[PDB]
């Protein structure tokens, strides 16, 4: 049951579990996935199961990739769940950058923002989308607003430094880049 203190370090005060509790979870985990590794397909299924009202395939895929297809270990699988469903968005900005930097080349492009914003948009039920502000109710509008808030040109590249600054300072950027299905819904 090693990676548990590793899980808590990389999670810190963000963890919603203790080492003894993570081990129990870990124990159940191994019963279901003996190898302790979970594939992208299996990960996607978790979200498809628990987000019946939406279409979480792309979202789950992007989340899985943020940890580098292939497989995730228990530590990543636990952290991945925390990133999407627990804690404060503010303690996840470094990870959020990893999420938005789709190809992982170190910077975020305009298209990459559209990719993630679209994936996140599909996590919203059709029902709740009518509550979205007019200038923020379609993937294109939201991604473009985000790009505008960072004052970028179509071919500009957004750095981690700037990403973190703006998501911290400009609360409208935070609202727009928001990736937690429940938080997006609640703010609406």
Binding site for Ca ion (CB under 5 A): 101, 103, 105
User: Which of 51/112 has CB closer to Ca ion?
Assistant: 112
**For the chain, percent helix, then strand, then coil, each to nearest 5?**
65, 5, 30
User: After which residues does a break in the chain occur, C–N more than 2.5 Å?
Assistant: 68
User: Which of 39/118 has CB closer to Ca ion?
Assistant: 118
Name 73's bridge partners: 37
Whether the CB-CB separation of 150 and 162 falls below 8 Å is answered with yes
Of 118, 106, 107, 91, whose CA–CA distance to 177 is shortest?
A: 118
User: Which of 103/156 has CB closer to Ca ion?
Assistant: 103
β pairing state of 37-39 and 71-73:
antiparallel
Of 95, 91, 89, 49, whose CA–CA distance to 76 is shortest?
A: 95
Nearest approach in angstroms of CB 172 to Ca ion is 23
Nearest approach in angstroms of CB 144 to Ca ion is 18
Nearest approach in angstroms of CB 109 to Ca ion is 5
Nearest approach in angstroms of CB 124 to Ca ion is 24
User: Which of 54/93 has CB closer to Ca ion?
Assistant: 93
Nearest approach in angstroms of CB 178 to Ca ion is 20
Output phi, psi for 37, to 5 deg.
-120, 140
User: Which of 22/158 has CB closer to Ca ion?
Assistant: 158
User: Which of 74/95 has CB closer to Ca ion?
Assistant: 95
Nearest approach in angstroms of CB 94 to Ca ion is 15
Of 148, 129, 147, whose CA–CA distance to 138 is shortest?
A: 129
């Amino acid at each position: 049951g090693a990676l548990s203190k590793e899980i808590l370090e990389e999670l810190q005060l963000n963890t919603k579990f203790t080492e003894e509790e993570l081990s129990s979870w870990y124990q159940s985990f191994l019963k279901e996935c003996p190898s302790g590794r979970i594939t992208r397909q299996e990960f996607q299924t978790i979200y498809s199961k628990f987000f019946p009202e939406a279409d979480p395939k792309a979202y789950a895929q992007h989340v899985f990739r943020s940890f580098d297809d292939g497989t995730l270990d228990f530590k990543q699988y636990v952290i991945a769940l925390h990133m999407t469903s627990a804690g404060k968005t503010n303690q996840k900005l470094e990870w959020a950058f990893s999420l938005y930097d789709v190809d992982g080349n170190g910077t975020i492009s305009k298209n990459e923002v559209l990719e993630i914003v679209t994936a996140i948009f599909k996590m919203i039920s059709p029902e709740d989308t009518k509550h979205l502000p007019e200038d923020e109710n379609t993937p294109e509008k939201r991604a473009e607003k985000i790009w505008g808030f960072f004052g970028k040109k179509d071919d500009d590249k957004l750095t981690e430094k700037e990403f973190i600054e703006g998501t911290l300072a400009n609360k409208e950027i935070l609202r727009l880049i928001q990736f937690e299905p429940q938080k997006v819904k609640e703010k609406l």
